[PDB]
Write a protein that binds this ligand. Structure first.
Ligand SMILES: Cc1cn([C@@]23C[C@H](O)[C@@H](CO)[C@@H]2C3)c(=O)[nH]c1=O
Ligand SMILES: Cc1cn([C@@]23C[C@H](O)[C@@H](CO)[C@@H]2C3)c(=O)[nH]c1=O
Lengths: 313, 307
């Protein structure tokens, strides 16, 4: 069977991920590498109206005390469902085609983001921003789809000062607090994958939090530097101080989904061509999979092109 | 490996699903009850009250369809969390299809109640967008072997009498919602048969507009998605929504549906449910320790979230 290479470029907005991705794709044949863009049209029109504007306006109104935390949470939660729908549905139809882990791939699919961006990362950052409840973040976590073999995720690194300078270009609003929260969440994500792959057991180390980044290299991180640290919220604890079981099971799901992912870090503090070639070099050490049927390649290729045409900006 | 029989008791609220299941369970059979405590306290405060109050406010014109939908959507996430997390942790223990089972797990509802049925009913009540409904559909967990779902049958008037008796804390007696949820579950049963008999929604889609043996597509859940919000200016369904329907079809086709007549006494309902198990599909578990782990999960869920 032909082989497939799936690469999800993710991380905070504003680093140059979208450009880097298209430049990489521009290098190959329009036949053997396909780009799956951010579903901007779904967010602005198809799924709901101007969802990005809605998210930023909602946080703004909350910050100004014009609406309550409760009002903000219902709006953010619904907005986040809209944000992740194209990702979830694409993952669901792609799933049956992915075989086991496995010369160049017959096909390379480069995605602008993985489902965890909308089902975990942005929801967790909004929780830190006070516009989402930790229970809702964990409900999204419990719904993250099974991690398919060959899930390569490239997260980005960029000094905060450079990031802030880039970000400030312009339904978005310049929110440095949100920028800090999303950078922190993705940093914790990278550490969480490393923690799990180094054999870390959150249930075994939970008590190391009580007293208040590299994804594929380095020593095992402390649990306090992983995503697990975010769920020590009073809302999630029983009178006896322990986490309610319903939430503990959601963390078990988080561990299971992230532990099998192959994570890489891309340095975005360089020119667009530099980012492209650095990613290209990284792509060499990534895991390919076989596909399940002979026609899986053309089918997958058609799905990606249809997705891009219908939902890409 | 030992065998497991999973039975999900589902269908419209107010038929007596909970009462009947209880009388049924009363060591080789465990009951995962309605997670009322999660709904009223752990996940959020009085979610049921929130849901019915919101619809009521919408019906009275005190809030817009838009405001209602964001509330219903967020609330449905809270409602389905216990089912979703339970399915996710149970999944790795389920093996392939397989004497009596070593363990029989009876659940008060399946994840599709909160990720498909109630959202579809609220869409019909004007309080949820169809795009949100399809977003929940896209998140329905893969259907594992041995997914036996028991749905109920009960005449409308009788159902209304029981509904009046079975109101949950914060619930408002809403006959329009009762009709909507009864319609959705009826379409659900028809949809499973439609798919099992080879129906292809893409092939029959034209029948919704252009006017073996199986139900007409117009009598399946697919008909609900001919919603204009999901269509392009030329009337074609956007691909992103067509893909969600492809997911819907894949998830539902392999479920094994059984109809329980609730139009009888609690003891009768209980016995009928027991009668239905002979045709249910059992599976093996994946590890020697799966059974004990499953039991613990079920007991812990009940103790923590059951009423
Ligand atoms: C995936 C995803 C993105 N976003 C944001 C970040 C950026 O401003 C922009 C482009 O990614 C859009 C609003 C979000 O808020 N939630 C999400 O799940
Ligand atoms: C599963 C589920 C139930 N409900 C309702 C119907 C009944 O009033 C009660 C008991 O089932 C509770 C509020 C709902 O609204 N959404 C859902 O996903």
């Amino acid at each position: 069977m032909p082989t497939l290479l799936r690469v999800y470029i993710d991380g905070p907005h504003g680093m140059g991920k979208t450009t880097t991705t298209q430049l990489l794709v521009a290098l190959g044949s329009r036949d053997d590498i396909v780009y799956v863009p951010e579903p901007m049209t779904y967010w602005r029109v198809l799924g709901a109206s101007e969802t990005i504007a809605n998210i930023y306006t909602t946080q703004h109104r909350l910050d100004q005390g014009e609406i309550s935390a409760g009002d903000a949470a219902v709006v953010m939660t619904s907005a986040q469902i809209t944000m992740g729908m194209p990702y979830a549905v694409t993952d669901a139809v792609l799933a049956p085609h992915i075989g086991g882990e496995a010369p160049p791939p017959a096909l390379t699919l480069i995605f602008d983001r993985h489902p965890i961006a909308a089902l975990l990362c942005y929801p967790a950052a909004r929780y830190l921003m006070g516009s989402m409840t930790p229970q809702a973040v964990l409900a999204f976590v419990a719904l993250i789809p099974p991690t398919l073999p060959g899930t390569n995720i490239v997260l980005g690194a960029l000094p905060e000062d450079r990031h802030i300078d880039r970000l400030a270009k312009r339904g978005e609003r310049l929110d440095l607090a949100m920028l800090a929260a999303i950078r922190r969440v993705y940093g914790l994500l990278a550490n969480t994958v490393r923690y799990l792959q180094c054999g870390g057991s959150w249930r075994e180390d939970w008590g190391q939090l009580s007293g208040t980044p590299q994804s594929n290299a380095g020593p095992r991180p402390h649990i306090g530097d992983t995503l697990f640290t975010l769920f020590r919220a009073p809302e999630l604890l029983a009178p006896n101080g322990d986490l309610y079981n319903v939430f503990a099971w959601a963390l078990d799901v988080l561990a299971k989904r992230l532990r099998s992912m192959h994570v890489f870090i891309l340095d975005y503090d360089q020119s667009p061509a530099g980012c492209r070639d650095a990613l290209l070099q990284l792509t060499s050490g990534m895991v390919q999979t076989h596909v399940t049927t002979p026609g899986s390649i053309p089918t997958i290729c058609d799905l990606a092109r249809t997705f891009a045409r219908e939902m890409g900006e």
